[PDB]
Design a protein around this ligand. Structure first.
Ligand SMILES: *CC(=O)N(CCCNC(=O)C(F)(F)F)c1ccc([N+](=O)[O-])cc1
Ligand SMILES: *CC(=O)N(CCCNC(=O)C(F)(F)F)c1ccc([N+](=O)[O-])cc1
Lengths: 239, 239
């Protein structure tokens, strides 16, 4: 378990990524990097994980990503890919297995249009912790409602189990991490006027890849309390 | 020339797109939609243009794009694609001709990483007209400097004529429209500590596709003055 402890300030930069593997620089509670990890798991890609201490970053980490953000992929050839959506798509193209994005140009364009429908949700999750009372919480539940009703329409129009069709695909993995945190953020009743989106959540937790990666509510709260204090230990909560 | 006049509020929705063509809903001074038009021209795609009056939109236009934004593509099958970058990539995949994005997953990922380096520039252009004096203009030239130095690094690292290699490609077309407006916005000296980016601009204006689409500074100022008054005529400046 200790093997997953994060690298921070003072740590030695890492050696090369071995042939036959790809490396992901990540952080165990980071929903942006969960995306890439979902994709790695669904496609069966052999990989290694380096958790980055995002409150106490290694200086050499900016050599990996000048923005200082996880996730970052690094392969045996020494190529560096960052930005979550870009990492996920790189993996879908570069590796064999289940294709998560469709081949059809239009179908693929739809998945991205849907991604765009969702694009306000991550910064609402952010600003969810600018909320300090029952009033700001009310308003916030509303902002989440207006965005979830956009996704509800897509499911209503298509009448498919998942956003990309009847099978799970990239779009679902790209959005899942923020819905995973909804329960523990006390926002699960924002889906009660979106009955298909609510059924989508339940189908997601049944996906073997989702399920293998889900963080318990308990673990997530531990992380959150420490995150909100700029604690250098947040990243390693539980160890 | 009158053929290019915009459709506004009151206009009849359009008929179907004919077979052998794709339609772009656009606006002649919209840099987001210029992207899609650059791509249409570079790939030699037969198409028709409907200019949308963005200060006085047709109601039926929201049926084309629930966000109400140009550009939107509509094909003969009746499929609808919006968001500029998504339109451009759809076109690159769906149509024959010069491939604007590379086949290599990593090379393609780089183009998108560069796109991401540029992603603050469009809203700086926006906020460029929140500038009302020589002080806010000073600060603004600085904000533009910090972003252009990021692109300068990419050119320094690669030592290529264009951002995607020695040939012009998608990334260049995706960023060009905001650099096109820089002169007329009185920001051309923001490139004077980025000598490669400045040489990139000159090479761009030599590209036959760029050149066929460039709006004169004169035409652009006409548009801007009317835009800044919420004039329903802005869109059709010159006719
Ligand atoms: C890694 C990652 O995705 N982020 C985005 C965090 C968005 N907010 C949250 O997840 C919430 F408040 F916890 F709900 C990220 C960026 C930086 C850190 N950090 O510990 O400094 C964590 C997560
Ligand atoms: C169509 C398009 O790209 N936009 C973005 C405008 C960004 N600002 C500018 O170009 C500048 F101020 F002119 F420099 C867009 C959106 C809406 C309209 N409109 O006329 O309402 C025009 C352009």
């Amino acid at each position: 378990g200790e093997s997953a402890r994060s690298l921070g300030k003072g740590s030695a930069p890492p050696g090369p990524v071995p042939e036959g593997s790809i490396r992901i620089y990540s952080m165990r509670f980071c929903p942006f990097a969960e995306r890439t990890r979902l994709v790695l798991k669904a496609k069966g890609i052999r990989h290694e994980v380096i958790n980055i201490n995002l409150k106490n970053k290694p200086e050499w980490f900016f050599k990996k990503n000048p923005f200082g953000l996880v996730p970052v992929l690094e392969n045996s050839q020494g190529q560096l890919i960052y930005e979550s959506a870009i990492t996920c798509e790189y993996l879908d193209e570069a590796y064999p297995g289940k294709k998560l994005l469709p081949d059809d140009p239009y179908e693929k364009a739809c998945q991205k249009m849907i991604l765009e429908l969702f694009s306000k949700v991550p910064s609402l999750v952010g600003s969810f912790i600018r909320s300090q009372n029952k009033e700001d919480y009310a308003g916030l539940k509303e902002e989440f409602r207006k965005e979830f009703t956009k996704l509800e329409e897509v499911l209503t129009n298509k009448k498919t189990t998942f956003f990309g069709g009847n099978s799970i695909s990239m779009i679902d993995y790209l959005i899942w991490p923020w819905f995973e945190r909804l329960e523990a953020m006390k926002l699960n009743e924002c889906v009660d006027h979106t009955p298909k989106l609510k059924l989508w959540m339940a189908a997601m937790k049944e996906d073997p890849t989702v399920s293998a990666l889900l963080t318990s509510e308990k673990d997530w709260q531990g992380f959150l309390e420490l995150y909100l204090q700029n604690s250098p230990e947040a990243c390693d909560y539980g160890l």
